[PDB]
mmCIF file of C-alpha atoms and ligand atoms in Angstrom:
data_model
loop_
_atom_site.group_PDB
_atom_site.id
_atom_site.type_symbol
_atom_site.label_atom_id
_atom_site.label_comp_id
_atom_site.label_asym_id
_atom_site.label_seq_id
_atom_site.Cartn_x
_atom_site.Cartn_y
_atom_site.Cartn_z
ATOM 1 C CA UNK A 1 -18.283 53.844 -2.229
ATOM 2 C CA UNK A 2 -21.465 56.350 -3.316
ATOM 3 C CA UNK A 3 -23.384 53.669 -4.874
ATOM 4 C CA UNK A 4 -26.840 55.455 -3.963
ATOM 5 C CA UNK A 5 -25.395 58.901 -4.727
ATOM 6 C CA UNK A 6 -24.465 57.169 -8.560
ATOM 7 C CA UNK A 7 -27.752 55.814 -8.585
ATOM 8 C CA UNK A 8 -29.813 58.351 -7.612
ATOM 9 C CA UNK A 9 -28.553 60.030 -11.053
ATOM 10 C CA UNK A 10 -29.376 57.786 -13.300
ATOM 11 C CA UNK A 11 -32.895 57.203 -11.528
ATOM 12 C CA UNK A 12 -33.845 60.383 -12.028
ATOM 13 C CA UNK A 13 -32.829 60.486 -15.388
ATOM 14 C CA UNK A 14 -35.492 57.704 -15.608
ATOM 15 C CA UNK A 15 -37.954 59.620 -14.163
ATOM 16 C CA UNK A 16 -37.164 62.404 -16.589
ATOM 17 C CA UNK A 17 -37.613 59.941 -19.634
ATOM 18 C CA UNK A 18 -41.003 57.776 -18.258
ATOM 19 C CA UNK A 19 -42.707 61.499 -16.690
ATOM 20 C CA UNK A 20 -42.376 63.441 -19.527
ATOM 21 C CA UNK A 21 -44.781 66.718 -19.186
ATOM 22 C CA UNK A 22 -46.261 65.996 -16.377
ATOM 23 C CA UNK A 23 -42.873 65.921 -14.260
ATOM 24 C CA UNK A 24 -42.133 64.767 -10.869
ATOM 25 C CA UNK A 25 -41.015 65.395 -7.495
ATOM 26 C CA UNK A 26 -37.439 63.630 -6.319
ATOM 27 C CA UNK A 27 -37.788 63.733 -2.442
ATOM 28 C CA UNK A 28 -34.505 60.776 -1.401
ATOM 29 C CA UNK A 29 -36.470 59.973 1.900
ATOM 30 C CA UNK A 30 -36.144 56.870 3.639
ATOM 31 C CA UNK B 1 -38.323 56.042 -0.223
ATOM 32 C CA UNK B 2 -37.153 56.029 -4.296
ATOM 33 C CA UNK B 3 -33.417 55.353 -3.085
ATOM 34 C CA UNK B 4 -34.002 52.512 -1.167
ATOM 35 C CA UNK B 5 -37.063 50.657 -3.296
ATOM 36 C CA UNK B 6 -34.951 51.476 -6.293
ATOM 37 C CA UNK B 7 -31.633 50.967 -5.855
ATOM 38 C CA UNK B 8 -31.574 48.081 -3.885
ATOM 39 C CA UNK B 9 -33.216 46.353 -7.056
ATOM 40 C CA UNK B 10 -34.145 47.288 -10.315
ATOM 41 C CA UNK B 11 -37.679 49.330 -10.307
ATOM 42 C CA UNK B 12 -39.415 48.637 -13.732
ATOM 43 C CA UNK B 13 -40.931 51.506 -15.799
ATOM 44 C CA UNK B 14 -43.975 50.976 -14.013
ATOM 45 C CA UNK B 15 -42.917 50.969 -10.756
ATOM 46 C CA UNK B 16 -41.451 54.306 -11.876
ATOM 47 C CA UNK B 17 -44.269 55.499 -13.129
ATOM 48 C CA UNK B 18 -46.372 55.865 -9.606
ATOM 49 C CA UNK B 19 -43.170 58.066 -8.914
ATOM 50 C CA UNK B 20 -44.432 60.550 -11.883
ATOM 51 C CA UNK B 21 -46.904 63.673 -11.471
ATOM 52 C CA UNK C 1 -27.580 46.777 -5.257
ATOM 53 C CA UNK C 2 -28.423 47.717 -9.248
ATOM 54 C CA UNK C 3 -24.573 47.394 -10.491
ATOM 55 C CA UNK C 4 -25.154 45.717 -13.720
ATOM 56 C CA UNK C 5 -28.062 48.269 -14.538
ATOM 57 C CA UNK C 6 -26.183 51.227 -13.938
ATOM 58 C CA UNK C 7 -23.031 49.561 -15.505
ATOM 59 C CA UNK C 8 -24.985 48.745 -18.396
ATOM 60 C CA UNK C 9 -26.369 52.087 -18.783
ATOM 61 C CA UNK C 10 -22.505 53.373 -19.650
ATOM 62 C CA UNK C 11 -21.598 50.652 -21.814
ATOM 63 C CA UNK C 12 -24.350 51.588 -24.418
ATOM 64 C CA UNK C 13 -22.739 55.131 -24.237
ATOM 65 C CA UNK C 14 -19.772 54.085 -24.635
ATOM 66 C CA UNK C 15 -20.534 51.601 -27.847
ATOM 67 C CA UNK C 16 -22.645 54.923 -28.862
ATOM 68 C CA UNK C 17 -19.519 56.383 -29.194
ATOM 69 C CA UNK C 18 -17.099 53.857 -29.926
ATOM 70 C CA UNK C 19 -19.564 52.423 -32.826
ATOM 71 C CA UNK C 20 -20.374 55.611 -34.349
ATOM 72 C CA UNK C 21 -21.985 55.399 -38.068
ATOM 73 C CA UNK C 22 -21.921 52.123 -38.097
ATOM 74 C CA UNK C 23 -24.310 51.377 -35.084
ATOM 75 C CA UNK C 24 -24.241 48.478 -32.556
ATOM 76 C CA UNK C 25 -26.533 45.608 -31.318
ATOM 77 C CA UNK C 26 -26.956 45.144 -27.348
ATOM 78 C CA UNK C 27 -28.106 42.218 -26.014
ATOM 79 C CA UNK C 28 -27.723 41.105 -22.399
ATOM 80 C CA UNK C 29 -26.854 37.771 -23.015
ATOM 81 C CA UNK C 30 -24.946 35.566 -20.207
ATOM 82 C CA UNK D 1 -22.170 38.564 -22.918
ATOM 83 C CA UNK D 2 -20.970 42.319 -21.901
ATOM 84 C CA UNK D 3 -22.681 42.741 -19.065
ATOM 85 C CA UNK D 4 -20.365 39.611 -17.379
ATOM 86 C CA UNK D 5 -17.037 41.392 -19.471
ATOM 87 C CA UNK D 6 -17.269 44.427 -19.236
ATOM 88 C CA UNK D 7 -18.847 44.938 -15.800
ATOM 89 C CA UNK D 8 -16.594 42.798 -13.828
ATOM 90 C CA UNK D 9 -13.795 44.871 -14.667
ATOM 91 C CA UNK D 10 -12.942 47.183 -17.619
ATOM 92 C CA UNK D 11 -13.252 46.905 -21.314
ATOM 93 C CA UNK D 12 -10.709 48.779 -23.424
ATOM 94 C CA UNK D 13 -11.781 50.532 -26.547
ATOM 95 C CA UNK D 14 -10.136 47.491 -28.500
ATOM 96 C CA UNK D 15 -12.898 45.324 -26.369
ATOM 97 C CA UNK D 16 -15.764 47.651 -27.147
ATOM 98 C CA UNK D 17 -14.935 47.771 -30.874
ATOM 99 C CA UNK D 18 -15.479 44.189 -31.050
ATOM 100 C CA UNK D 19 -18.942 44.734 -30.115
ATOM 101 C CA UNK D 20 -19.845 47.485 -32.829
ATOM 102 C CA UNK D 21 -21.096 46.525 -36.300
ATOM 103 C CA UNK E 1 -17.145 45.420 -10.645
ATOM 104 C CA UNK E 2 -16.128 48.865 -11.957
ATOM 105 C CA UNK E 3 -17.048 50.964 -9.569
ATOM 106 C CA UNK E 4 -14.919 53.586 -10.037
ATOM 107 C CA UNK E 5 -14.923 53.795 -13.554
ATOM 108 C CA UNK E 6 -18.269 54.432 -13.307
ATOM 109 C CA UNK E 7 -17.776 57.088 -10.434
ATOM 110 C CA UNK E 8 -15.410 58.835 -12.481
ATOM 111 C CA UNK E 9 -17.367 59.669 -15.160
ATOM 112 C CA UNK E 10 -19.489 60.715 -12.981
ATOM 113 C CA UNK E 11 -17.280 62.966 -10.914
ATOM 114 C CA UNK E 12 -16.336 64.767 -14.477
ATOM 115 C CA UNK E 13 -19.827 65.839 -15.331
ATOM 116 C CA UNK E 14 -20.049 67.043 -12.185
ATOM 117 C CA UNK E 15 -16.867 69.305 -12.479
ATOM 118 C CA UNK E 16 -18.260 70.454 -15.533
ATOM 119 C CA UNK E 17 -20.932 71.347 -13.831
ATOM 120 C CA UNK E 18 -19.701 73.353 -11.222
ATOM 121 C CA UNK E 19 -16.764 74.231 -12.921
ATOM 122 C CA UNK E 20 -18.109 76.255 -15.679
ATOM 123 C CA UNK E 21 -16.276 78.732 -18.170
ATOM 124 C CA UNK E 22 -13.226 77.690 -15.816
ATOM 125 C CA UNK E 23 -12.511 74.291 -16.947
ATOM 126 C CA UNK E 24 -10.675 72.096 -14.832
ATOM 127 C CA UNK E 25 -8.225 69.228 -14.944
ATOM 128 C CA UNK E 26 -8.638 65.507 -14.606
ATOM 129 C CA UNK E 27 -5.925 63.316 -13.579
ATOM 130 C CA UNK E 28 -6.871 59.976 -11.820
ATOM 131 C CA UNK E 29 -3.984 59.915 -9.497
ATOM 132 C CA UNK E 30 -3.978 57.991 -6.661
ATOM 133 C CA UNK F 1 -6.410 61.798 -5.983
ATOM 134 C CA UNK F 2 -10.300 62.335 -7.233
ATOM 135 C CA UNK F 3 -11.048 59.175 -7.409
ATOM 136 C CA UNK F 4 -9.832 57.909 -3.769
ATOM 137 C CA UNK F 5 -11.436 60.998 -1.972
ATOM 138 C CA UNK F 6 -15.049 61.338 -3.845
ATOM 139 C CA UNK F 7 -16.196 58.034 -5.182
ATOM 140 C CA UNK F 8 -15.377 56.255 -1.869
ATOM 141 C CA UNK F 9 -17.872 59.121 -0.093
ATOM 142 C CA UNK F 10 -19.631 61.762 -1.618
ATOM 143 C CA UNK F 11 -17.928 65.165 -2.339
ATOM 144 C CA UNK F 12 -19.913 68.379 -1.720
ATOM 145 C CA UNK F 13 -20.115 71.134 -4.089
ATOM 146 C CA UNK F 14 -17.126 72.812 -2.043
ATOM 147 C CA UNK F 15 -14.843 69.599 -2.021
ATOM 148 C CA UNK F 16 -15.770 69.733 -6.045
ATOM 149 C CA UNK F 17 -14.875 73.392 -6.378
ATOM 150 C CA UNK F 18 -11.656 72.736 -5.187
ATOM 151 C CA UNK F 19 -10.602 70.735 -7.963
ATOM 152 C CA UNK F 20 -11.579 73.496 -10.709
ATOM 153 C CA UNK F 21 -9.168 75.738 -12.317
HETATM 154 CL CL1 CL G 1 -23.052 54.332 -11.936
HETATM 155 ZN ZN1 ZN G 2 -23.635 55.942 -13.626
#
């Protein structure tokens, strides 16, 4: 299954919501 | 990294946070 | 794993659209 | 509650309806 | 779980995505 | 179908297009 790929999304739709202006960087390393 | 601490468990909106700019 | 989060996350969409006008409560209650 | 119904396998739109106002 | 109900809907955003002006079909057919 | 081939492993941008009109 892509359980990390499906929750990678909604993560950074999170990160989106909680960042606001100031943004972020989405860097999926281990 | 985020994949692992995060989707392993929940992260709460604070550990999100030190994820932010 | 975070199933039940990310599950979760689609229900509400899904009452969002079910519901409409009329609006829904969510509670995550066992 | 939904979480335990509608997570462990799928809720219909009959199911759903039953948890709008 | 639902797993791939949750995939799915997934899976369509991303045609639309990629997709475009195009369009596509969805048929869940095994 | 879909469903069998990309949410049992992820499906590139390529595999996707192929499913586009
Ligand atoms: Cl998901
Ligand atoms: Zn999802």
């Amino acid at each position: 299954f892509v359980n990390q790929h499906l929750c990678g999304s909604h993560l950074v739709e999170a990160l989106y919501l909680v960042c606001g202006e100031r943004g972020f960087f989405y860097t999926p390393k281990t | 990294g985020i994949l692992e601490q995060c989707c392993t468990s929940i992260c709460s909106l604070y550990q999100l946070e030190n994820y932010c700019n």
